[PDB]
């Protein structure tokens, strides 16, 4: 029971991976731009293909009788994922990070060719930094027919440090910083500017009001005349999001050119027809907060999506790599040690499952659709 | 009373240019909002454009915005509409209205002119 | 993009023409009616009150979302398409006429 426990765990973890992501690209098909997405569930996907070679090598404990060639080729392959998809996940999180932080010099990046390009250089930079798996994928000369099908280092005993800090350093160390440091600067940009489109709106609200007691034209003209500096404050403060200048940006034109309207017919000496005017913005500002908070919604999800999917990552492998590098103070592995690292392991490939779930989950319409399918299949 | 004489419809070439007048009697265009709305055969109202002259400010649809360009002119009481870059959907008959109060375009435009037809065609 | 609706009915009908908005309509639509080849003719303006030259069987009603417009006696002059001038929401064009309800005679 115990040890075949081990490949049926993982056999569990290939069947779901492979369902949920295909889900994420037929949804996709039919958040993230539409295009890491797909190209990090393309990363789960080929290395789950890959995933029962492997297994079959747990049940065999050392049987590699598929060839040479698919040694080296399915090995490299178990590692090219720890390393694309952080690059990846990385991509990810510049992609949002220049078009939140720097948007006027990140308009030309941001293109679909560009970002095609970007992930093709990606998977080429996943197959030179695994470069010591292709040297030493060779099959292991086990005793007897069988081969195993490992990484033979030429100093096992000492080259053993360089080969596993080298892994942990480019797949989880720098990655992590870099996310990381994106997503503090990127919430503090979307806390600013969240905190400035209503600040500015709570200008216009104040000002309004004077407007309906203003008894001559100099009230009126002063009072609408900050009223103007906040609304274009306002409009330049748009373009500090990407989910938040395609959208909030349109609107500015009507409003600028409203107070235009009511402040030069200020200048007129017309109070009664200025207040008129005025009166009309009750409705550009009752249309301000409608569409505000329909964005400011809509740019949380895109944020905590985002977020949700690098954080499973770093916390599913997390523990894999504490013991991982525990392992190198204490060689000698004890009994608990065993377990703990085969549940380091089947939480790390977990990965394959979690990110689809978590993607499908906290999209609300589609999980909707799920909910309704179940009452019917119920009955 | 307040009348609107429209003009300058015809044949133009895709690519081409028309510039459309509203001759505008009974008041004075200074103060008000002229609106272009335009009707495509067999189709719904269209808003186009709109102007208030007395403050210069200038609003346009985004299926025109950067090719029509909208003006008046105050001396001879008349709204231009200035078509660049037409296209075969720009045909239609363009209707010029304005609201009872300049800034009361939201609660309807009262007095509209007959309309004029533009046929862009090759 | 989408044909006029057709509501058909007969001379001295209640009919009832709706224009349902995105968000809670205050008091800002206008309803138009078009005979077909002539220039559309505003009926009731701020969704409450009378225009002028309208008789009072025209009057349009505010139900959540849904704004109506209600004619008390149809008549044979008033059969034509009916256009709403929907809530300006933010972002859009500055004035947007809904599809008409074009009310045709029945038999």
């Known amino acids: 029971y115990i040890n075949i426990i081990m490949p049926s765990v993982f056999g569990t973890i290939c069947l779901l991976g492979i369902i949920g992501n295909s889900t994420v690209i037929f949804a996709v098909v039919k958040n993230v731009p539409d295009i890491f997405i797909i190209n990090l569930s393309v990363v789960d996907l080929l290395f789950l293909l890959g995933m029962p070679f492997m297994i079959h090598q747990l049940m065999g404990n050392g049987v590699w009788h598929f060839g040479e060639t698919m040694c080296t080729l399915i090995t490299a392959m178990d590692a090219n994922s720890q390393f694309t998809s952080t690059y990846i996940l990385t991509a990810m999180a510049i992609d949002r990070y220049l078009a939140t932080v720097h948007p006027i010099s990140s308009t030309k990046f941001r293109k679909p060719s560009v970002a095609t390009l970007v992930i093709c250089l990606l998977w080429a930079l996943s197959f030179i930094s695994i470069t010591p798996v292709w040297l030493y994928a060779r099959l292991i000369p086990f005793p007897g027919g069988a081969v195993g099908c490992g990484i033979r280092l030429p100093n096992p005993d000492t080259d053993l440090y360089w080969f596993t800090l080298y892994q942990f350093f480019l797949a989880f160390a720098l990655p992590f910083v870099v996310i990381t440091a994106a997503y503090v600067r990127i919430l503090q940009r979307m806390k600013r500017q969240l905190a400035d489109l209503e600040d500015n709106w709570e200008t216009l609200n104040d000002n309004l009001k004077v407007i309906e007691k203003a008894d001559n034209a100099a009230q009126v003209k002063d009072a609408l005349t900050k009223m103007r500096a906040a609304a274009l404050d306002a409009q330049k403060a748009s373009g500090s999001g990407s989910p938040e200048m395609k959208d909030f940006r349109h609107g500015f034109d009507i409003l600028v050119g409203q107070i235009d309207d009511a402040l030069k017919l200020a200048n007129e000496g017309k109070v009664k027809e200025a207040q008129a005017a005025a009166e009309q913005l009750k409705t550009t500002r009752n249309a301000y907060i409608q569409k505000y908070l329909l964005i400011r919604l809509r740019t949380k999800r895109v944020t905590r999506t985002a977020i949700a999917i690098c954080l499973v990552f770093f916390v599913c492998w997390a523990p894999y790599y504490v013991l991982q590098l525990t392992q190198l103070s204490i060689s000698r592995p004890t009994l608990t040690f065993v377990y703990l690292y085969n549940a380091a392991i089947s939480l790390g490939y977990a990965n394959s499952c979690l990110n689809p779930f978590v993607y499908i989950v906290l999209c609300e319409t589609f999980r909707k659709r799920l909910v309704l399918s179940v009452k019917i299949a119920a009955l | 009373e307040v009348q609107l004489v429209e003009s300058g419809g015809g044949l133009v070439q895709p690519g081409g240019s028309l510039r459309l007048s509203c001759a505008a009697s009974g008041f004075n265009i200074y103060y008000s909002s002229m609106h272009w709305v335009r009707q495509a055969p067999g189709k719904g109202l269209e808003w186009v454009a709109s102007?208030?002259?007395?403050?210069?400010?200038?609003y346009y649809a985004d299926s025109v915005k950067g090719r029509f360009t909208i003006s008046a002119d105050t001396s001879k009481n008349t709204a231009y509409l200035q078509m660049n870059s037409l296209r075969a959907e720009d045909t239609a008959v363009y209707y010029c209205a304005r609201p009872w109060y300049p800034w009361s375009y939201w609660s309807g435009l009262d007095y509209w002119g007959q309309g004029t037809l533009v046929t862009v065609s090759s | 993009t989408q044909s006029p609706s057709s509501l058909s009915a007969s001379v001295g009908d209640r009919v009832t023409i709706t224009c349902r908005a995105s968000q809670s309509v205050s008091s800002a639509v206008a309803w138009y009616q078009q005979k077909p080849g002539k220039a559309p003719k505003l009926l009731i303006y701020?969704?409450?009150s009378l225009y002028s030259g309208v008789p009072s069987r025209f009057s349009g009603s505010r139900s959540g979302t849904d704004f109506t417009l209600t004619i008390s006696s149809l008549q044979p002059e008033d059969f034509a398409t009916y256009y709403c001038?929907?809530?300006?929401?933010?972002?859009?064009?500055?004035?947007?006429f809904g599809q008409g309800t074009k009310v045709e005679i029945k038999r």
């Open positions: 701020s969704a409450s």
């Open positions: 102007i208030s002259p007395y403050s210069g400010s200038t």
């Open positions: 001038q929907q809530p300006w929401s933010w972002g859009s064009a500055l004035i947007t």
